[PDB]
Amino acid sequence: SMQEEDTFRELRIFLRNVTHRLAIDKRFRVFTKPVDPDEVPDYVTVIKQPMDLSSVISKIDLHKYLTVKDYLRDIDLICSNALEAAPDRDPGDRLIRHRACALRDTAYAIIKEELDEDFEQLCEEIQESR
Ligand SMILES: [Cl-]
């Protein structure tokens, strides 16, 4: 229905807002774009499912997220990919992991504070009905 399409529209607007807020945070700059094949060629081999905040925006616009849970799966993937790609004790890797963890925590905290759980439940029930 149009009411359901309106709901999905509201979700995309909200998701777009949260993602923007993430993407402008200077700590999260390394997560804003795909990793560069030239800068390191082993990334595409070691990371099977690359994800970044620009790809998240593209997916919102392609109507790929019908629930907040589906969006958070991609935020989690950005984080888990970073942890896997930067696992060592050296300061460079620890900085990346710290920032990855902060990205995840920030997204979750924004969502906890700003998303009505009944809105999410509605999204889930429309998704399940299709
Ligand atoms: Cl830096």
Curated annotation (Swiss-Prot):
Subcellular localization(s) per the UniProt record: Nucleus
Induction record: Up-regulated in breast, uterus, colon, ovary, and stomach tumors. Induced in breast cancer cells overexpressing NCOA3 or treated with estrogen. Down-regulated in 5-fluorouracil-resistant derivatives of the colon cancer cell line HCT 116.
Domain Bromo: from-to ranges: 3-114
Tissue spec. comment: Highly expressed in estrogen receptor positive breast tumors and in osteosarcoma tumors.
Coiled coil: 108-130
Domain of life: Eukaryota
Subunit structure: Interacts with ESR1 and NCOA3 and these interactions are enhanced by estradiol. Interacts with acetylated lysine residues on histone H1.4, H2A, H2B and H3 (in vitro).
Function: May be a transcriptional coactivator of the nuclear receptor ESR1 required to induce the expression of a subset of estradiol target genes, such as CCND1, MYC and E2F1. May play a role in the recruitment or occupancy of CREBBP at some ESR1 target gene promoters. May be required for histone hyperacetylation. Involved in the estrogen-induced cell proliferation and cell cycle progression of breast cancer cells.
Family membership noted in the UniProt record: Belongs to the AAA ATPase family.
Protein name: ATPase family AAA domain-containing protein 2
UniProt source species: Homo sapiens
Record lineage: Eukaryota, Metazoa, Chordata, Craniata, Vertebrata
Residues of the full protein shown: 981 to 1108 of 1390
